[PDB]
Symmetry: D2
Subunit: 268 residues, 4 copies
Amino acid sequence: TGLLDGKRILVSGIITDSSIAFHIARVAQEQGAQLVLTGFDRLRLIQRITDRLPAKAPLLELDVQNEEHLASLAGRVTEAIGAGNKLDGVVHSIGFMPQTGMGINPFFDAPYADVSKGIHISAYSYASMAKALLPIMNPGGSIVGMDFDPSRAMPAYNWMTVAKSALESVNRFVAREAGKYGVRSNLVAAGPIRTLAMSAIVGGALGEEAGAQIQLLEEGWDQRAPIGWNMKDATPVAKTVCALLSDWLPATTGDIIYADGGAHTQLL
Amino acid sequence: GLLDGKRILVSGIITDSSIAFHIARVAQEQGAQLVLTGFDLIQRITDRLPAKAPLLELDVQNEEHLASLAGRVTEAIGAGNKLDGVVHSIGFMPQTGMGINPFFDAPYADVSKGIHISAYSYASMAKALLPIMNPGGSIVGMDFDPSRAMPAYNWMTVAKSALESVNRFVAREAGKYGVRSNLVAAGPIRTLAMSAIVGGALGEEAGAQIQLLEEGWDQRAPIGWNMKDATPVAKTVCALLSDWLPATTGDIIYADGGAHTQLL
Amino acid sequence: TGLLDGKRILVSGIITDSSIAFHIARVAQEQGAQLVLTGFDRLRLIQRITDRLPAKAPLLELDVQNEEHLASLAGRVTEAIGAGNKLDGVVHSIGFMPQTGMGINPFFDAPYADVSKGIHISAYSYASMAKALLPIMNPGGSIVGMDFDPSRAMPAYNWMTVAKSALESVNRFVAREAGKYGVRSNLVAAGPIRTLAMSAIVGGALGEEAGAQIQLLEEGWDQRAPIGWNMKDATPVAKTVCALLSDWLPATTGDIIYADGGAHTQLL
Amino acid sequence: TGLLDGKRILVSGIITDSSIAFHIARVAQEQGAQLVLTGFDRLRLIQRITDRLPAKAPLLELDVQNEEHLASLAGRVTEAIGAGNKLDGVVHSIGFMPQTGMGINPFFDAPYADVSKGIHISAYSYASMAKALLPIMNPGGSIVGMDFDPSRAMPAYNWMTVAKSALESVNRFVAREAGKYGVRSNLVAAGPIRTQLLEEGWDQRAPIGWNMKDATPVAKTVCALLSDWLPATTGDIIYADGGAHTQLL
Ligand SMILES: NC(=O)c1ccc[n+]([C@@H]2O[C@H](COP(=O)([O-])OP(=O)(O)OC[C@H]3O[C@@H](n4cnc5c(N)ncnc54)[C@H](O)[C@@H]3O)[C@@H](O)[C@H]2O)c1
Ligand SMILES: NC(=O)c1ccc[n+]([C@@H]2O[C@H](COP(=O)([O-])OP(=O)(O)OC[C@H]3O[C@@H](n4cnc5c(N)ncnc54)[C@H](O)[C@@H]3O)[C@@H](O)[C@H]2O)c1
Ligand SMILES: NC(=O)c1ccc[n+]([C@@H]2O[C@H](COP(=O)([O-])OP(=O)(O)OC[C@H]3O[C@@H](n4cnc5c(N)ncnc54)[C@H](O)[C@@H]3O)[C@@H](O)[C@H]2O)c1
Ligand SMILES: NC(=O)c1ccc[n+]([C@@H]2O[C@H](COP(=O)([O-])OP(=O)(O)OC[C@H]3O[C@@H](n4cnc5c(N)ncnc54)[C@H](O)[C@@H]3O)[C@@H](O)[C@H]2O)c1
Ligand SMILES: CNC(=O)[C@@H]1C[C@H](NC(=O)[C@@H](NC(=O)c2ccc(Cn3cccn3)cc2)[C@@H](C)OC(C)(C)C)CN1C(=O)c1ccccc1
Ligand SMILES: CNC(=O)[C@@H]1C[C@H](NC(=O)[C@@H](NC(=O)c2ccc(Cn3cccn3)cc2)[C@@H](C)OC(C)(C)C)CN1C(=O)c1ccccc1
Ligand SMILES: [Mg+2]
Ligand SMILES: [Mg+2]
Ligand SMILES: [Mg+2]
């Protein structure tokens, strides 16, 4: 008797067992969901990671910049879940911005080709995934994407923050389209999580200044959060995504739920 | 159920159309053990709920009621037991501050009474109940998006703006106990008073204003909005009372069909 | 040839020469405005302060909690500016919250009588002043109130922050009424300024913790502000109020202009 | 004795005499500003439009998608305003989104190449212009961009609304960089200007009304930000929309 019993859910964005999508997939399976997973480029490496999940799940290739992958996606998902079956949930947990657009590089020095690639993968692809999958979604369905509150500028995140601002706007338009199918579309704005890349930057991969900037940003988050914030723990974020995938927020769409310890509601 | 074994206090039941009646019904269906509070007929309404629940008197303007509340709740749930959830579903604004009366004609005594009951009491209830709440607990209040001005709601909208600010401060206090505090901003629901205003209780003008506001709500909402159905709102409150949004506090969840995210 | 040449403007809220209203009045006069001033309770003391302004201006008594003062206000202003003349501008620079609702006192320990008095003076009175003065305002006129960004909770400001959230809502309703007269209504959200009460709290009037909290808040403001923030300087705030009183923002109403060094737009 | 007396201001985005930039340029000149104008592609056609302004102003070519135009811009402006002189103001009044990403075309049918072009011109270029011009801006200077409130989704505007959400974020980062030079960066979010149901709703929501045929209130707001009268506002958005965004109905 789990929160997502009988639900068929697609989960994108697993690359390591530290990926937010790995924790979303794990919690959904613990809650009785039947998953279809999508991975990018390193499929053999992703399969070894997905073997660590509590249950077996088919793994499909999906490069969001690849038009052929998007055009064939619904058919490939239908084959994996069986003809006559449709999805109840879709999780977009995909984000990318080259090092020229986030980190140490000055905001003004990011070339447009890099920013454009980052926006394609991080924001436009939320619309691409909804376009491909809405024709195979059941009424009462739910599409969830991952966000990082971009309402105020911050050091280092730079063009990734710009990509999140675009993503929030894209989510509002996706909700208009999804509504026609009786499907909700929402974003979960998470606090900072120490995923593979974040641990490296903290360790000094981008130098002394970038490491210090991320450290000050994270410490401030746990300080502002009335219930605190654990950057090593994606479980509260995964649970929030599962709450939106469930039947328990049936009147919320085109919206943003903050799984950030309440940090964004406090100044100091 | 979603709330199996949880001990939850629910305030604000007056009729079986009250948002709190639907919150209480859904919470019991989901395995919660309730304590109810009423302001005084309520007993006859609460007898219509799926399960028996003790009913305590609570006038939020009454200092003695607030000072004795924790002790009275402890007696009802048994010594050694604490609350996991608290629902504030209390709102009031005299007709001089809400409806047909011009915005400038509301006397301060009426506005102040409305703010005391609709906003300040969220802090009063948290103060009284936090000492008897378990870690991982949840306090939820009812909101109506006041980010933009609208016809007729007038000083009630002002009271909701104050409530949203109060909720952010309540979260700071609640955090010390490992407790969350959040508001559910609902779309319009046809509760006893709303049905009367639509029927023409406040006249032709006020009835037409509320109707236009509602018609707009369903057209803006990408998934539509059913003003006669409180169940999506009750479910959202239960989602916040559950362990499934454990990192959300001082915040607002919109159970409005997504209307607030669309211009037209 | 000033920004406010020939404009008749009412300015409330002068108590000391550090009052934001004193600086608003000084800048307005430097810019060619003809003022009417209102003072609360200590009129003889206020007259000694207003004698320090560049030009003479009549001083009227106004306690916003006094119904008789509000009912007679328009007639008293008309007598001061001459029959057949009307106001072009109104400045609300009035705020109050008892120490039980702001400072060291726990948020939960503020009695409602104190909170209600603070809301009456800080938020409801913005509507009271508009009701009294709109019948004696010219088209193209402007009503301006003072705000402190209450979108996020902060230590020590407690119930004063709640009062500002109410004020922002009141301003949006005042704009609906003012629009009928061709008059704009807006708030200026200022950064922290060391005025009478704020200087005392910093000095330790509410104890060590309240003083330390305000100090940390002010320091954070200057670091977040891309152009910095000088808490001892009310001139940038006074200039912003004068910009709203001018004919240069003719399509802005029910709104909030931030004179805070841009601090509210930055996380760190 | 105008609002912008002695100020040297660059104004981009004039294409017709109904362009918001034309009205910004006209009001700035009426207020004593000395202008430098930039135009895209149809320079001969733009020059004839700029001749309609009250005063003469040099016209420079600027395609924001052209890296060479951006790299040479500061030097070309300095030559026009004379050596030893710097700008006090910069106006970005540039926007574009292909018809596949706007109007009638379904939101899902806009190819990424079109959306990317729209974002490059409408959002990224605000950063490009600031990068090129900040080294030739005076302290107390002001950069202003044109915005359309994208906080809520609306019919037809689709990917242009997405581009404005990106622009708002870009403006907040530009303010961080501009602050180092003592320069402010802000956007003016305007109501609809005729350069129908959505536009009709605006006038009824606006407490002071909204005239879609009149760009002068928008031009005046931009001039207010270019002046010394909002010296503590940066990374922000000023709404010149009749107050429509503050009202539900
Ligand atoms: N880690 C945090 O602090 C944080 C905070 C808030 C939100 N988020 C967001 O959560 C999501 C997941 O990020 P994460 O932190 O788990 O990092 P991650 O690196 O583990 O996951 C990002 C995923 O994006 C995938 N991806 C990149 N390019 C792709 C393409 N062309 N096609 C398909 N997939 C592609 C990667 O393969 C990877 O699986 C992102 O949207 C991210 O921005 C992260
Ligand atoms: N459309 C809507 O109905 C709507 C929309 C959004 C939010 N809400 C909010 O939901 C909440 C519940 O409203 P409702 O629509 O269910 O109406 P309701 O009339 O059924 O409930 C209001 C409750 O407040 C109680 N109350 C009033 N004064 C009190 C006092 N002094 N002490 C204690 N309790 C007191 C009343 O007894 C009543 O039970 C309110 O906060 C309301 O503003 C309602
Ligand atoms: N100082 C800051 O950091 C700061 C920041 C943002 C906004 N503000 C706001 O600016 C405004 C002016 O405050 P200030 O900082 O200049 O301090 P202040 O003490 O100089 O001004 C407050 C004024 O309100 C008046 N007032 C109080 N009760 C009144 C009543 N019953 N009737 C009429 N007038 C009454 C006082 O007499 C005084 O002149 C207030 O609205 C305040 O909240 C101040
Ligand atoms: N018209 C409205 O309703 C409205 C509302 C709010 C904001 N705005 C904004 O105001 C600005 C001006 O638009 P407008 O309404 O005056 O229309 P417009 O068509 O007159 O101006 C847009 C300008 O962008 C220029 N431009 C396009 N591609 C360019 C490139 N590659 N390099 C340089 N410049 C380029 C065009 O040449 C033109 O001068 C835009 O940012 C627009 O989004 C307009
Ligand atoms: C000029 N006024 C006075 O001398 C005194 C200071 C008194 N102030 C207060 O009671 C309290 N102060 C305040 O009420 C207060 C007012 C404005 C600010 C400025 N601000 C910053 C952010 C937002 N607003 C700050 C505070 C109290 C928290 O301050 C003490 C501890 C310094 C006393 C109000 N006064 C009154 O006389 C008074 C009396 C009755 C009604 C209203 C005012
Ligand atoms: C200088 N302008 C011109 O003469 C033409 C109009 C052309 N406009 C567009 O393609 C499109 N227009 C637009 O891109 C467009 C630009 C600005 C606005 C103003 N605005 C309103 C709300 C918010 N902002 C509105 C629209 C397209 C949606 O419009 C058609 C259907 C009228 C063609 C771009 N132009 C170009 O030549 C052009 C070509 C390549 C790149 C950039 C501009
Ligand atoms: Mg903390
Ligand atoms: Mg609809
Ligand atoms: Mg829990």
